[PDB]
């Protein structure tokens, strides 16, 4: 199916504590594969997925020099934005960016993107056309004009359709055994007492991959997507994910509820009861 190459960049200033913290984390679909962290003597770009061992000295050297340049750019940006917003030189501030591209099953671009944020709020973004920008406030508008005059859009789209797409396909090739695998979920159900003669039924789904999955509780065919509680899908530390969903049902009426697990690794969906 479709695949994606995403880069999460963060630069946080810490007045009176030295230079800002800079971080770049790379993802190919749901698994982390690269990372740069300014906090470390000799900070370098490091592999985060096993298959990245197939890269070679050159790859790491270039990405590192590239990351250090970006680090300095955001260092300057933080100072620039204090001017745009008329802010104190002693308060902490954050800049974030999510850049990336998604390709179809055939490897051809489906979409590319780049969205910035200042202090947790939208700043500037590349529109789906990859030709224009959309600024969230008057500060971002100054950035938009600078980028329009410099022709940043063509440069970014050249990367999105070119470098981003080609390297994504390469990563998928080299890491096929891991990125193209399917780990089927293992479901479980737990029960916990409750005050007013009611019970909590929790449905667990463990060890799956990719991340996308659907968990539901039903009462005689009808989905109870209302009084149902749940957590967002979470990584489990070995490249797999987990999730849980629960409903509060009347004591002694438990056998009337069923948990449904839909996933790529499940030819036919799982149904559980307590």
């Amino acid at each position: 199916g479709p695949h994606s190459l995403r880069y999460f960049v963060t630069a946080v200033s810490r007045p009176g504590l030295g230079e800002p913290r800079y971080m770049e984390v790379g993802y190919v679909d749901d698994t982390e594969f690269v990372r740069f962290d300014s906090d470390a003597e000799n900070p370098r770009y490091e592999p985060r997925a096993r298959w990245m061992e197939q890269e070679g000295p050159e790859y790491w050297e270039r990405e590192t020099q590239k990351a250090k340049g970006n680090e300095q750019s955001f260092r300057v940006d933080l100072r620039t934005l204090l001017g745009y917003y008329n802010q104190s030189k002693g308060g902490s501030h954050t800049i974030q960016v999510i850049s990336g591209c998604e390709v179809g099953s055939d490897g051809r671009l489906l979409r590319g993107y780049q969205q910035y944020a200042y202090d947790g709020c939208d700043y500037i973004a590349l529109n789906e056309d990859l030709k224009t920008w959309t600024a969230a406030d008057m500060a971002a508008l100054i950035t938009k004009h600078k980028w329009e005059q410099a022709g940043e859009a063509e440069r970014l789209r050249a990367y999105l359709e070119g470098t981003c797409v080609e390297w994504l396909r390469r990563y998928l090739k080299n890491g096929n055994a891991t990125l193209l695998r399917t780990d089927s979920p293992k479901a479980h159900v737990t029960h916990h007492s409750r005050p007013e003669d009611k019970v909590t039924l929790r449905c667990w789904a463990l060890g799956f991959y990719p991340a996308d999955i659907t968990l539901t509780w039903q009462l005689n065919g009808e989905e109870l997507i209302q009084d149902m509680e749940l957590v967002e899908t979470r990584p489990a530390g070995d490249g797999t994910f987990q999730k849980w969903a629960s409903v509060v049902v009347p004591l002694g009426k438990e056998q009337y509820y069923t948990c449904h697990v839909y996933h790529q690794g499940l030819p036919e969906p799982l149904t559980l009861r307590w």
Partner: peptide
């Protein structure tokens, strides 16, 4: 491979 960002 990562992009080289341009200043804001």
């Amino acid at each position: 491979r990562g992009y080289v960002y341009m200043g804001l």
